């Protein structure tokens, strides 16, 4: 009976493979051949931020496009003013091992988490002129890998227990739990509408979830190893992923299939971070070789290189206005490029 | 061309920097270690000298100061500990059935790409249990390991007074297999320090201080260009 059900499962997978083959009329390469090339893109370091005394694991940009937050294993979180390179605040953390940080859209709160298995919220604006912890959220049985804020009272988190959750900050409890991965979850991205999100895991698969009904609409496959990074295209109808097999791939939600792969023979190291420009023409990635490569999304050709670090590049970000890019490293420094 | 309020903000930033520098100086006075074990090891009782995601212990010997971490809450989280002074690995010598599983785990840690420059201290626990099984003669290491029968204890090897020849051949045999993996891979970068221990033994903390003194000395010879 168990074996009989296993045969039924394979039959359904066979039907799924046939349907996506029928929709493969053409390739992205044959449609975009006539388009003229982007050119050569050269960028320079415009600012260097110094203060952390240990490797940096995460960073996030404010909606204003002038203020940013960074997290390091020295047990400290810092808020910076990019234009004047001044430090607005420094926050002491109870546990040294932190793997994630987030900035609220309102600008009134920040969040951090790690091997402690807890996500903590901090109130930036209060009388008494100090920053204090507001709530601590507990319930996950594995390390916290990523966290993002839907609103002042809503946050989504990912974990190494193979599960994701949505929380109510005032109550301190989880409204919904999303389950179905067989491997640790490493990354999360939220759509512009805020009605859907995508996740990537060590099982080499990515899933799309609906926030209101707690269900998995579609599953995507193709990579040969763990996926460490995920991002959403500006329209909201496509997404990009990066893995330790040294390749990056682009997927389309409506077609339900991979459109293109970005790879070169010289590159043999893994990819740690991914981001897109405001138009979506350029894709930016970070590598363990200490260098960041720029790619033309439409034609899959490398256009530039931005290398300024003596250790592994761990994080990347682009401003909402589109003016600048920020990078972080295990060398203890952050740089701004334009 | 500069505002009064802008000058005051810059003064606040300089004061924040002074506090961060002072906190960093406090860290260079302390040494950090990671504990790894398989649950039949008895790893928790190793340091009798002093005392969900992560657990910690603190102890001090001869004015130097030490902190130990156990993540009992491994491929992805081991990247964080690439700057620790040393890693402590514990095994139960008496269990013949689980010995091969322990050997495979050690090989993965020794050959990991983020732990290339980190040295390992190996503790072989339950040495009292091994002695009674060897003397009793009901259980034979030869059944689990075929090459043991064609083994002779090293000619220059010396054992503690009173220990039977049989125990000396068996103890030396189990120590040799782990040292073999260490010699085979990384060279000129890392050494394994092997010790045999029992639950009652109270000298474990002194042994760790001695091994760290060797680790710092070897790095200084490299920094000064002598070697």
């Amino acid at each position, epitope marked *: 009976e168990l074996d009989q059900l296993r045969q039924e499962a394979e039959q359904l997978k066979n039907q799924i493979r046939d349907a996506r083959k029928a929709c493969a009329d053409a390739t992205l390469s044959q449609i975009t051949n006539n388009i003229d090339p982007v050119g050569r893109i050269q960028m320079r370091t415009r600012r260097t931020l110094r203060g952390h005394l240990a490797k940096i694991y995460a960073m996030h940009w404010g909606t204003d496009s002038r203020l940013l937050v960074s997290a390091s294993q020295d047990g400290k979180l810092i808020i910076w003013d990019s234009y004047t390179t*001044n430090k*607005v605040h420094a926050i002491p953390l109870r546990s040294s091992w932190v793997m994630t940080c987030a900035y609220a859209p309102s600008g009134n709160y920040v969040a951090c988490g790690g091997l402690d298995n807890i996500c903590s919220i901090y109130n930036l604006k209060t*009388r008494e*002129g100090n920053v204090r912890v507001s709530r601590e959220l507990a319930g996950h049985t594995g390390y916290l890998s990523c966290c993002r804020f839907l609103d002042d009272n809503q946050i989504v988190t990912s974990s190494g227990d193979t599960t994701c959750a949505l929380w109510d900050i005032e109550t301190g409890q989880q409204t919904t739990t999303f389950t179905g991965h067989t491997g640790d979850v490493m990354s999360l991205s939220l759509a512009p509408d805020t009605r859907l999100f995508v996740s990537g895991a060590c099982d080499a698969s990515a899933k799309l979830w609906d926030v209101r009904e707690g269900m998995c609409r579609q599953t995507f496959t193709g990579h040969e190893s763990d996926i460490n990074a995920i991002c959403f295209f500006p329209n909201g109808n496509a997404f990009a992923t990066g893995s330790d097999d040294a390749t990056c791939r682009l997927f389309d939600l409506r077609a339900d299939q991979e459109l293109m792969t970005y790879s070169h023979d010289n590159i043999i190291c893994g990819i740690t971070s991914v981001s897109f420009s405001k138009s979506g023409r350029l894709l930016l990635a970070g590598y363990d070789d200490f260098n960041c490569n720029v790619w033309d999304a439409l034609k899959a050709d490398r256009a530039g290189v931005l290398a300024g670090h003596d250790n592994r590049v761990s994080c990347l970000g682009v401003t909402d206005d589109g003016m600048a890019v920020a990078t972080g490293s295990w060398d203890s420094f952050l740089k701004i490029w334009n | 061309t500069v*505002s009064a309020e802008d000058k005051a*903000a810059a*003064e606040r930033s300089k004061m924040i920097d002074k506090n961060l520098r002072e906190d960093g100086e406090k860290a260079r006075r302390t040494l950090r270690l990671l504990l790894l074990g398989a649950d039949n090891s008895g790893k928790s009782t190793i340091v009798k000298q002093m005392r969900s995601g992560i657990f910690e212990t603190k102890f001090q010997v001869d004015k130097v100061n030490f902190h130990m971490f156990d993540v009992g809450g491994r491929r992805k989280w081991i990247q964080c500990f690439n700057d620790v002074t040393a890693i402590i690995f514990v095994v139960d010598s008496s269990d013949y059935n689980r010995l091969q599983e322990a050997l495979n785990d050690f090989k993965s840690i020794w050959n990991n790409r983020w732990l290339r420059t980190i040295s390992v201290i190996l503790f072989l626990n339950k040495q009292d249990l091994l002695a009674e099984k060897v003397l009793a003669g009901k259980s034979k290491i030869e059944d689990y390991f075929p090459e043991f029968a064609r083994y002779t204890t090293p000619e220059d090897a010396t054992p503690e007074p009173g220990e039977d020849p049989r125990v000396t051949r068996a103890k030396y045999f189990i120590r040799k297999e782990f040292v073999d993996i260490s010699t085979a891979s990384g060279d000129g970068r890392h050494i394994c320090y092997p010790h045999f221990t029992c639950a009652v033994d109270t000298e474990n903390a002194r042994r760790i201080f001695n091994d760290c003194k060797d680790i710092i000395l070897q790095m200084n010879l490299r920094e000064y260009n002598l070697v």
Partner: single-chain antibody
Amino acid sequence: VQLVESGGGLVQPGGSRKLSCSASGFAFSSFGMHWVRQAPEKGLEWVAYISSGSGTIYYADTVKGRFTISRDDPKNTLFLQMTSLRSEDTAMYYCVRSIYYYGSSPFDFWGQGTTLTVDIVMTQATSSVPVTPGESVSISCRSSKSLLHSNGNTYLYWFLQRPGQSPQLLIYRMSNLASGVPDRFSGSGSGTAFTLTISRLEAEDVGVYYCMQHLEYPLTFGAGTKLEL
């Protein structure tokens, strides 16, 4: 948050006295502190400033050479030593707290005050405007030099003193509104000309309104305008 001040009384001319302020409910060390005085029937005038960390100290020309400012961070106290007193020194003195960082609101809290008995020019021409409940009013301030800076910020502040009490911040940096303040109040202007508009006037809006500049030291204030029913 509370600031309480003591040390005041009749003094003969040529004498000396020390005034003290005690702070509670907030982090005293992280905030810069100032002093201001109001003459018997006149308006607000600034006296001195001490920075957090005690790095920067500034003084008005009239009191320079005869007054000193100090702070004790462990005991949460601030002091003013005054020497060679003259008749012009009679007034009421107040303690004010200020913090400076991107997006901060300076001059937020003021103490009750103690009584002792012994440059950019800002002009608000109207001295009195009669008002009725339920109507909209506008108040205007003019400046000798433009308050707009190349950074893109214009530095002008508005305050209200209702009868029998200390001054309260209403607007900072021309357009921003302070916390705990009703949305009826609004501020607009250009370098050298500024306006504050109050809609749906109600009782409790009666008092004297003042304009101040923070572009450069010394800090200066306008004479004030009174709204009366």
